[PDB]
Amino acid sequence: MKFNPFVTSDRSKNRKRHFNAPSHIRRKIMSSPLSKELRQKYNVRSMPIRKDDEVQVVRGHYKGQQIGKVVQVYRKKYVIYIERVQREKANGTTVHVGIHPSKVVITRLKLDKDRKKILERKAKSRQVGKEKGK
Amino acid sequence: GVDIRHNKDRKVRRKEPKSQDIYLRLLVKLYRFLARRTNSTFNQVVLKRLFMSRTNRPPLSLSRMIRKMKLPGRENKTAVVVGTVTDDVRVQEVPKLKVCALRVTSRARSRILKAGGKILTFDQLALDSPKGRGTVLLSGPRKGREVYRHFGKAPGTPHSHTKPYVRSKGRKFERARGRRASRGYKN
Amino acid sequence: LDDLYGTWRKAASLKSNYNLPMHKMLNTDLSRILKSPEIQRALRAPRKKIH
Amino acid sequence: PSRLRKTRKLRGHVSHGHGRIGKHRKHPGGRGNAGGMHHHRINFDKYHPGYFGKVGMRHYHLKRNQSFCPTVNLDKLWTLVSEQTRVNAAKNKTGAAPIIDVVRSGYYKVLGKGKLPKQPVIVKAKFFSRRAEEKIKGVGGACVLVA
Amino acid sequence: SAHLQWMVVRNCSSFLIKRNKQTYSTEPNNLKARNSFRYNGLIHRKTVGVEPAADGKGVVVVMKRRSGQRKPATSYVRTTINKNARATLSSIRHMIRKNKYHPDLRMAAIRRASAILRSQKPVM
Amino acid sequence: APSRNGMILKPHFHKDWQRRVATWFNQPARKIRRRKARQARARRIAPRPAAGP
Amino acid sequence: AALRPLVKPKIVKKRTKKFIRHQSDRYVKIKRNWRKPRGIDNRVRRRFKGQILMPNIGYGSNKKTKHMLPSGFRKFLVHNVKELEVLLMCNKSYCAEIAHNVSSKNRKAIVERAAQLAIRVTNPNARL
Amino acid sequence: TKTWRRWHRRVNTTQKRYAICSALAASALPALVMSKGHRIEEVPELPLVVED
RNA sequence: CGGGCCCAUACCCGGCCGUCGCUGGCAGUCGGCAGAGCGAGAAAGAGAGUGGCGCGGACGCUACGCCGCGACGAGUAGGAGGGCCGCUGCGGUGAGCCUUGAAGCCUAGGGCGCGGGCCCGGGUGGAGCCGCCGCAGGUGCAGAUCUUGGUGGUAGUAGCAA
RNA sequence: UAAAUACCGGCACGAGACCGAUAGUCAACAAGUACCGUAAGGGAAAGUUGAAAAGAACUUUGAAGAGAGAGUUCAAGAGGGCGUGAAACCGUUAAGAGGUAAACGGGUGGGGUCCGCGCAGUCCGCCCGGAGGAUUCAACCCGGCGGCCGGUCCGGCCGUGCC
Ligand SMILES: [Mg+2]
Ligand SMILES: [Mg+2]
Ligand SMILES: [Mg+2]
Ligand SMILES: [Mg+2]
Ligand SMILES: [Mg+2]
Ligand SMILES: [Mg+2]
Ligand SMILES: [Mg+2]
Ligand SMILES: [Mg+2]
Ligand SMILES: [Mg+2]
Ligand SMILES: [Mg+2]
Ligand SMILES: [Mg+2]
Ligand SMILES: [Mg+2]
Ligand SMILES: [Mg+2]
Ligand SMILES: [Mg+2]
Ligand SMILES: [Mg+2]
Ligand SMILES: [Mg+2]
Ligand SMILES: [Mg+2]
Ligand SMILES: [Mg+2]
Ligand SMILES: [Mg+2]
Ligand SMILES: [Mg+2]
Ligand SMILES: [Mg+2]
Ligand SMILES: [Mg+2]
Ligand SMILES: [Mg+2]
Ligand SMILES: [Mg+2]
Ligand SMILES: [Mg+2]
Ligand SMILES: [Mg+2]
Ligand SMILES: [Mg+2]
Ligand SMILES: [Mg+2]
Ligand SMILES: [Mg+2]
Ligand SMILES: [Mg+2]
C-alpha cells in the first residue's frame, strides 16, 4: 500500500505523466533487465537501454536465443530497434519492428565512464540497502 | 350478481409484529404455540399485546404497579406487563414484588432487587405458569402521550378544551381574537 | 476487553457510564422449552385429522 | 431511500396522482399563509382562535436571565440528596435533621405538590409557597430563606 | 442457541442460493441440501453428514461430538465405510437409531447414502 | 393554503438564501489545523504552561 | 433413454398465446411488451367486444404444474460442478441448466458429472 | 444536485455500543463465522487468543 | 291465444387462479428407553396409588413454513400492498463466470411466468460481466405544434420560360 | 496593533458511492475556435483501424474515379470519418398471397423452416427358479473411536445464586 500523501494512485494522472514524460524521463522508463551473468557480476538488476547494446528478445513473434545489437532507441514511440529483428514490406523493403525494452534482456553493455559511474552507484545503493536490511 | 358491499370485508388487525427483533420473534413463536394449544385466554391477550406497536404498549411505572398489586385480594401474585417497567422517583417504600416484563429500566431493576423481589422474562414466565394461572395483567396509561391533548373537538369551537398547534407559548401568540370577549367574540 | 465493555455486575471502567445491554428472553432454546414437562402437562390433545 | 417512495408507483399513470379535472397548478390559493381573513378565514377560526389582534402590554428590553426562576416539588425534593442521608436521618435517635440546598441543586422556588415522608428536614430555598411551607411544617421542620 | 443462530442465518448466509424459484443451502453437513432449520448442518449441537470418500469408493459418515462446540478442529469425527450397499445402509441406520443421535433424519441419511453408492457405481 | 389542523409557520426563506449557504465540509480539516497550531505553539513555548497565563 | 421424472401429470395451460401491447402492430416504436392501457376512451381498457385481452389473475396456472417444463422437470441454472451436488438429492424432480457464459472445457466436465449423478441436463450438447 | 444535501448521519452512542457488543458476541459462534464464510474448520478454538 | 324451440359474462353443477374470513390445524418426527388417539349431538382423566425369537416403522416443519374449510372477484379520479419485475453505483458474499471467448447486437430455434420479463440454442463480435444479502439514486416514455440526429411518401414530380 | 475569521480569481497539489462524448465546463479534438452581426455581443459540430502500417508490391480492363486477381494480418467479416454496427428507409434472393385500404381479437385448417439427434419403447425394489464367481455371512477375540448413563462413583469449572 502507498502511504505518501504526495503521489497519486490516479490512473488518469499516471497515464498522462507516462505519455507526456520528457526525453530524459523516457530514458529512465526505457529500462531493460541485465542477463543473469551480468546481473551476478555487477549486482545491478536493470539499466536504461542504449543505442549499441547486444540484447535478446524474450516475448512475442520474434522471441528466440539470438544476440542482436540495438540500432536506434526511438524514444517518441517507446520502442527500440535491433539489427536483425525486421519484417518484409510489400514492395521488398525491410523495415524494423519496434519492441518494448521491458521485453528485452541486455547481454553486453556499452561501457564508458558515465555508464560505469551509474553501475557503481547502483551497486553501492544495493550494498547499503542489504547492510541495513540484515 | 350478489348484492353485497366489500368495504369492510378485510380486517385491519396485526397478524405479526412489525419489528424484526429476533428475540421478540422467538417469544412470538413460543406464545403462538401456547395460545393455540391451550384454552387459556391469557396467552391470547399476551401475544395480542406482543404484536402491538410501542405507542400501544406504553411504559408502566412502579407507582401504578405497587398500587395495583397492593389492591386487596391479589396478594403475592405475579404482575405481567407486555411493556416497560420504569423507575418512579417520588416513591419511598417498595414491597416485595414479582415482576415479568419485556424490559425493566436499570434503576427500577435495582430497586426491585434490593427490596427483595424477583424479575422474570417471558420464557421463564411460560415455564413457571404456562396457563398464566396466578397472574395480574397490567398495562401503562395508553393516553399518556402528549398527542392526545391535540385530538378531539377542534379548538375555536364552544366547549372544546383542545390544545392548539402553536410554535411558542406567550402573550403575542394566538390569544386575542377568538379568545377574548373584548376582541370580537369568545367561542 | 472485559474492562472495556463491563460485565453484568461490574460496569465498564473505561466508559464514563456504561453497562451491558440486557436480554428480553434468557432461555433461547425454544425446542427445549417446548418439550419440557411443566409445559407439556398443560396442553390439549393435538388435532391432526385432516377433514 | 427513493426506492420506497410514492413516485416509483406513479410511473405510467398520467396525472402522477393529482387528478385530471383539477390539475396540479402552481399556487392556486396564494403563497404562504395569506388569505387568513378572506378565503382561509374559517380554517384560521376553526384551528387558530385568537391569531389576529393585539393583547396585553409591551416590554421593550426583556431579560430572561432577569426573570429566571426554576421550581421544584416536594415529590422530587428528597431525590436531591443521597438516599444514604435519608436512611441515616430516619435511623438516628438524636433528632438531627438533614439540610437541603435547592439553590445548590439548581432550583429557586419550592412548590408543594404531593406527599412528604414523615421525617424532619430543613430546606434552604430562595422562595417558598404557602402550601409547601405548610407541608414542611406538618412534617415538622424549618424553612429558611437564602440569597 | 440453535433457534437464535437460525434466526440470524435464515436469509443472510453465504451458503444460500436463491434462483429459479428454488432455495438451496451448500453447507457441508446438510442432507437434502435445502435451506431448512431441521436440515441445517451448522446450527445444531448434533448433525450427521454423508459424503463420498476421496478414494472414490464407499461413503464417509460424519458425526458431531458433544463436548467441543466452540472447538471446530476436534468437533467432527469421521467414519469411512467401504462395504456393500445393504450393510452400509444397516451400519448408518444403526449409528443413528441405536445411539438416538438426532433421529429426525435417518431416512434422509440413508437416502443420501444410497444415492452416493449409486453414483460410485459405474455408468452403463 | 392551509389544510386541516396544522401549525402555521413562518419560514425565513424569502431572501436570496441559496447565494449564502455556509457548508461545513472543511470542519475536520479545521480541527486538524487548530490542533496542529496548538501543538506548534506549545512546543515553541518550551517550559511554560501550555494554556498560557 | 431419457430420464423420467417421478410423476408426469397432464399440464394444462389456460392460454398459450402471449398478451401483446395494444396497438403495437401499427407502430415499430411500440414493442409487444405488455403495458396497461390507461386512456379515458380506450376500448381495450373498457373491455369492448372483440378487442385485445388483458392479463387477469384468473389466467394463473395450476400450482401443481407451474414452471414445469414439457419434460416434467423444473429448471435450475448451474455455473460449475459444485452446484450439481445441490441437485443430487432433488434427482427426480429438478433438472440442471448450464449458463451461456460457461466455456466448452467446463461444460464437458459439468455434463460428465451430471451423467454420473443421474441429473438431467436440458442443454447437454450445446457447444462441444 | 447541490453540495448541501444531507450527506452524513447521526447515531446514538448507546446503540453504537450496542451494535459493537452484538458484533463481538456473534464473532464467537462457529455457525455464524462459517455462515459469513471464513474457513475456520481447522481453527482450534474460535475465540482465538495468542500470547503477547 | 296454445305447445315447441334459439341464447348473455345472469342462475345451477364441476375444474383451476387470486383475495377475504375461520385472528382455523401442525413443535406429536414424544419408536425396542416403543406402544401409534383426540371428528364427535349434549362440561370435565387411554389419571395414580390405599383397604374391603427375528432389531424394523414413507413425506414432512425455508413456522416469513406447510396444510384444510367456506365465501367472494366491475371499475375512471384516488389510496394502499406485493414484485425471485427492470436500470446505474457502493458495502459483504458466490475458492462465481471469462481469449477453449465478456459486454453488446441479430435470430422462421426450445421454453418458463397471468404479467412486468427471464433462461437456454445458433450467428456476429473481441475484454470484461453477473447471481444472492443490504445501501444509494440524475432509475423505466408513444404523445408535450417536446430537444437533437437520421430517414421516407410526395417524386425522377414542380421546375432549370424577363 | 498579531491570533482565532473569509476565499467559485491565481500558482501547485490530493481525493470522490459524481458524468462517461445528445453526458460532464460552451470547449476530452488547431474552442471562446469556425461562423454571424455595423456594434454592444452571439457562438457551434467534431473521440476510437490495428498489437505493430505490416496502410495492399506486382498482373490486367478503363482517360479516370473505379474494379477483378495477388499479398499483410488471427481478422480487410478492421482498407485512412477504417472498434462493435441496432432502428427508420432501400436493393436483391426464397417462400406465400393479392377486386370491398391495410391492419387487429377468438377458433380451426393448410404449407413451410427448425427441434426431439424420436422410429421397436419406460422402469425401481422384494420373492421363486436356472445357470456362475468370491475371502464371504453370523458368533467369538484383540485394539481404537463415539453416544447415553452411575437412584447417590470420584474430581473439576461456572452463576444476571446465596450464606
Ligand atoms: Mg516514499
Ligand atoms: Mg368493488
Ligand atoms: Mg376499506
Ligand atoms: Mg388509476
Ligand atoms: Mg394524491
Ligand atoms: Mg390533464
Ligand atoms: Mg386543488
Ligand atoms: Mg404544490
Ligand atoms: Mg388538499
Ligand atoms: Mg368516458
Ligand atoms: Mg361453482
Ligand atoms: Mg362474481
Ligand atoms: Mg376488482
Ligand atoms: Mg482491444
Ligand atoms: Mg446517478
Ligand atoms: Mg420516443
Ligand atoms: Mg416535367
Ligand atoms: Mg430563368
Ligand atoms: Mg483521502
Ligand atoms: Mg457525437
Ligand atoms: Mg458535449
Ligand atoms: Mg456514443
Ligand atoms: Mg450513451
Ligand atoms: Mg466511432
Ligand atoms: Mg483502443
Ligand atoms: Mg474479428
Ligand atoms: Mg472489426
Ligand atoms: Mg465499423
Ligand atoms: Mg430485405
Ligand atoms: Mg415471388
State the CB neighbour count (10 A cutoff) for residue B14. 12
Q: In this complex, how many residue pairs, one in chain B and one in chain F, have their CB atoms less than 8 Å apart?
A: 9
d(CA E94, CA B124): 38
Tell me the backbone φ, ψ of residue F19, rounded to 5 degrees.
-75, -30
Are the C-beta atoms of A41 and A119 separated by less than 8 Å? no
Cα–Cα distance list, B73 to A44, B69, B70 (Å): 99, 9, 8
User: How big is the CA angle at H11 (ends H6 and H13), to the nearest 5 degrees?
Assistant: 150
Looking at beta carbons, which residues of chain D come within 8 Å of G36? Answer: 12
Nearest nucleotide relative to A2: CA against C1': J14
Residue located via cell numbers 406464545: B31
Q: Is the CB of G56 under 7 A from strand J?
A: no
Three cell numbers written together for G6: 417421478
Residues 4-33 of A with CB under 7 A from strand J: 5-10, 13
State the CB neighbour count (10 A cutoff) for residue B112. 23
Q: Taking each helix axis from N to C terminus, what angle separates E85-97 and E106-120, rounded to the nearest 10 degrees?
A: 160
Residue type, B128: D
d(CA E104, CA A32): 69
Q: Is the CB of E5 under 7 A from strand I?
A: no
d(CA E46, CA E75): 10
Q: Considering only the beta carbons, identify the residue of E5, E69, E73 that sits closest to H44.
A: E73
Element (H, E) at A23: helix A23-29
Looking at beta carbons, which residues of chain D come within 8 Å of F8? Answer: 33, 48, 51
Cα–Cα distance list, A112 to A47, A50, A69 (Å): 14, 12, 17
State the CB neighbour count (10 A cutoff) for residue G80. 13
For strands A68-74 and A54-57, give the pairing.
antiparallel
Mutate to test the interface with B, among E6, E7, E43 (most CBs of B within 10 A): E7
3-state secondary structure of B27: helix
Experimental method: cryo-EM
Q: Quickly list DSSP for E68-94.
A: -SS-GGGSEEEEEE-S-HHHHHHHHHH
Are the C-beta atoms of D125 and D102 separated by less than 8 Å? yes
Are the C-beta atoms of D135 and D75 separated by less than 8 Å? no
Resolution in Å equals 3.1
Looking at beta carbons, which residues of chain E come within 8 Å of C28? Answer: 1, 3-4
Query: What are the residues whose beta carbons fall under 8 Å from the beta carbon of B103, sequence distance 6 or more?
Result: B84, B85, C22, C24
Nearest nucleotide relative to E64: CA against C1': J146
With 0-12 / 13-18 / 19 or more C-beta atoms within 10 angstroms meaning exposed / middle / buried, residue B34 is buried
Instruction: Give Cα D95 distance to the centre of its chain.
Output: 38
3-state secondary structure of G33: coil
Residue type, D140: G
Q: Does E1 touch chain G (CB under 8 A)?
A: no
Residue C1 C-alpha, separation from nearest chain B C-alpha, in angstroms: 22
Q: Quickly list DSSP for A39-93.
A: HHHH---EEE--TT-EEEE-SSTT-SS--EEEEEEEGGGTEEEETT-EEE-SSS-
Three cell numbers written together for H39: 474457513
3-state secondary structure of D71: strand
How would you classify residue F15: left for phi > 0, otherwise alpha for psi between -120 and 50, otherwise beta? beta
Cα–Cα distance list, E119 to D108, E112, E116, E123 (Å): 89, 10, 5, 8
Nucleotides of J under 7 A from a protein CB: 4-8, 13-16, 51-58, 71-72, 74, 87-89, 102-107, 117, 122-123, 126, 145-148, 159-161
Cα–Cα distance list, B151 to B155, B167, B186, F1 (Å): 10, 17, 21, 22
Q: Residue D49 and residue B177: Cβ atoms within 8 Å? A: yes
For strands G97-98 and G77-78, give the pairing.
parallel
Looking at beta carbons, which residues of chain H come within 8 Å of F20? Answer: none
Looking at beta carbons, which residues of chain E come within 8 Å of B32? Answer: none
E strands within E20-117?
Answer: 22-25, 48-52, 59-64, 76-81
d(CA D53, CA D39): 18
Three cell numbers written together for D57: 402590554
Please, do chains A and B touch (3+ CB pairs < 8 Å)? no
Query: What are the residues whose beta carbons fall under 8 Å from the beta carbon of B115, sequence distance 6 or more?
Result: B94, B95, B96, B97
Q: Does F5 touch chain H (CB under 8 A)?
A: no
Three cell numbers written together for D63: 431579560
Q: Does B153 touch chain F (CB under 8 A)?
A: no
With 0-12 / 13-18 / 19 or more C-beta atoms within 10 angstroms meaning exposed / middle / buried, residue C50 is exposed
Residue located via cell numbers 551473468: A37
Chains that touch A (3 or more CB pairs under 8 A): none
Three cell numbers written together for G94: 429438478
Q: Residue F6 and residue D47: Cβ atoms within 8 Å? A: yes
Nearest nucleotide relative to G27: CA against C1': I142
Query: What are the residues whose beta carbons fall under 8 Å from the beta carbon of E14, sequence distance 6 or more?
Result: H35, H36, H37
Are the C-beta atoms of D72 and B90 separated by less than 8 Å? no
d(CA A30, CA A47): 9
Cα–Cα distance list, D92 to B115, D78, D89 (Å): 21, 17, 6
Residues 92-111 of E with CB under 7 A from strand J: 99-101
d(CA B136, CA H29): 39
Please, do chains C and A touch (3+ CB pairs < 8 Å)? no
Nearest nucleotide relative to G50: CA against C1': J105
Q: Taking each helix axis from N to C terminus, what angle separates B22-37 and E2-9, rounded to the nearest 10 degrees?
A: 120
With 0-12 / 13-18 / 19 or more C-beta atoms within 10 angstroms meaning exposed / middle / buried, residue B76 is exposed
Residue located via cell numbers 444536485: H1
Nearest nucleotide relative to G67: CA against C1': I112
Are the C-beta atoms of A61 and A98 separated by less than 8 Å? no
d(CA G74, CA B31): 38
Cα–Cα distance list, A132 to A21, A43, A118, A128, E58 (Å): 33, 16, 21, 6, 59
Q: How many angstroms is it from D20 CA to the middle of ligand 9? A: 15
Q: How many angstroms is it from G40 CA to the middle of ligand 10? A: 6
Secondary structure string (H, E, C) spanning F1-53? CCCCCCCCCCCCCCCCHHHCCCCCCCHHHHHHHHHHHHHHHHHHCCCCCCCCC
Task: Pick the closest to residue E118 from E85, E93, E76, E95 (CA basis).
Answer: E85
DSSP at D2: G
Three cell numbers written together for E8: 440470524
Task: Calculate Rg over the CA atoms of chain H.
Answer: 18
Three cell numbers written together for G85: 451436488
